[PDB]
């Protein structure tokens, strides 16, 4: 089982701008027959991932030339020299020199843009939710950016942990923007026995949480 | 002009196997190697089972985790791949790879998803501002679709003629049921002077619901 160390995971950019992605195998990529081994592959959102290069330094039929692939025994670089709208997508390194077959993590290429503090929504349950013993809180973390953002569910002060369901978009096409949306979910019996419920994200925009809340008495 | 399809994806109870099937259409099946590579939920490209040609002596390698539960079979035209005994963390998408020379080829992939559910239709709830409170310039609404299966909803904004400031976040699986929620941020001039609706279907259980969004 050799590794691939994929890095960095994430790379933003601005279209034009040139882009280097490395790769480090543990175990030497040097097959004893002398090949080196070694694919570079890039996956854009809803199809399958297309190889880029293959041993090491041979660019595919048909890939443009802003790509080229370069390294030897076990660190591997790729290159994108001027930086196209059609090349964001996930970049993964794999090598196919030792069984079994392995790849690294990927690395997202993404529009570089100014941060942004995510807009925060809270959501009590529903009337006709409740009417079925479910009660669902729900919170909105719309056009944030960076990605990165940490959600913490408190009722009555106190951090719960089980039954919260996260969803992440992708970054937005208009603004280069992400959302996020974070719901717990308890019985209706759990909402009735407690009053505070809130929403609190910690993003690198503020020094201190971001906190939504709401009193189910005040409902 | 190579050209891989798989076939031979849907649901799959535990315990229970299916049988994936590729046709490599554009080469000389006999001088590559064929693989089964799969791709999880999230972040996790996994490469599953070899079968080299005859210079290799048909040899056959499949990775640690499905290994005496799948087979790979050729027929030189085609691979096949048994799945049997199909857990959970099977699930994902399942591409078919033609490799030769150090180059690699990967058809469409099929997705396997492995549940112990059932068709059932979701409940749509309307997510209204804060218990009768404070929201409203700009006000931001909310639709939750709690609890369907399989696969496939569709959730529109006004039939569809409310495009901007929507958000719809990816379907999740909480415990063998999905959950799906949109967002959408008008302006205190709109609501809720005017009319805001929530539009879902489950073709699969052939709901079509309107839910509108009604000041809490
Ligand atoms: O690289 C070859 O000599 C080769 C030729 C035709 C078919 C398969 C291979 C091939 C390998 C042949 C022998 C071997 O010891 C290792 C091979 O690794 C390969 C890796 C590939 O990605 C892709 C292909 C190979």
């Known amino acids: 089982d050799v590794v691939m160390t994929q890095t960095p995971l994430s790379l933003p950019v601005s279209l034009g701008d040139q882009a280097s992605i490395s790769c480090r195998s543990s175990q030497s990529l040097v097959h004893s027959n002398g090949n080196t081994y070694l694919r570079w592959y890039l996956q854009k959102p809803g199809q399958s991932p297309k190889v880029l290069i293959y041993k090491v330094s041979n660019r595919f039929s048909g890939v443009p030339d802003r790509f080229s692939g370069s390294g030897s025994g076990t660190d591997f670089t790729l290159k994108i020299s001027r930086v196209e709208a059609e090349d964001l997508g996930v970049y993964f390194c794999?090598?196919?020199?030792?069984?079994?077959?392995?790849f690294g993590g990927g690395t997202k290429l993404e529009i570089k843009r100014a941060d942004a503090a995510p807009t925060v929504s809270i959501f009590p349950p529903s009337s006709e939710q409740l009417t079925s013993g479910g009660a669902s809180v729900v919170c909105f973390l719309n056009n944030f950016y960076p990605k990165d953002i940490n959600v913490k569910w408190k009722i009555d002060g106190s951090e719960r942990q089980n039954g919260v369901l996260n969803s992440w978009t992708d970054q937005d096409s208009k603004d280069s923007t992400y959302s996020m949306s974070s719901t717990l979910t308890l019985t209706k019996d759990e909402y009735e026995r407690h009053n505070s419920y809130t929403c609190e994200a910690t993003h690198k925009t503020s020094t201190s949480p971001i906190v939504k809340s709401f009193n189910r008495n005040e409902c | 002009e190579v050209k891989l399809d798989e076939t031979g994806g849907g649901l799959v109870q535990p315990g229970r196997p299916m049988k994936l099937s590729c046709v490599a259409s554009g080469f000389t099946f006999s001088d590559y190697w064929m693989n089964w590579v799969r791709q999880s939920p999230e972040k996790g490209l996994e490469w599953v089972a070899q079968?080299?040609?005859?210079?290799?002596?048909?040899?056959?390698y499949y990775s640690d985790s499905v290994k005496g539960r799948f087979t790979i079979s050729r027929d030189d035209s085609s691979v096949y791949l048994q799945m049997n005994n199909l857990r959970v963390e099977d699930m994902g998408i399942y591409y078919c790879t033609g490799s030769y020379y150090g180059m690699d080829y990967w058809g469409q992939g099929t997705s396997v998803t492995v549940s112990s559910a059932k068709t059932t239709a979701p409940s749509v709830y309307p997510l209204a501002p804060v218990c009768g409170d404070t929201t409203g310039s700009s006000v931001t609404l909310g639709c939750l679709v709690k609890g369907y299966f399989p696969e496939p909803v569709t959730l529109t904004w006004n039939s569809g003629s409310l495009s901007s400031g929507v958000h719809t976040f990816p379907a999740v699986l909480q415990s063998d049921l999905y959950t799906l929620s949109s967002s959408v941020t008008v302006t205190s001039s709109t609501w809720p002077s005017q009319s805001i609706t929530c539009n879902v279907a489950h073709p699969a259980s052939s709901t079509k619901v309107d839910k509108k969004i009604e000041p809490r």
């Open positions: 079968i080299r040609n005859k210079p290799y002596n048909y040899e056959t």
């Open positions: 794999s090598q196919s020199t030792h069984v079994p077959w392995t």
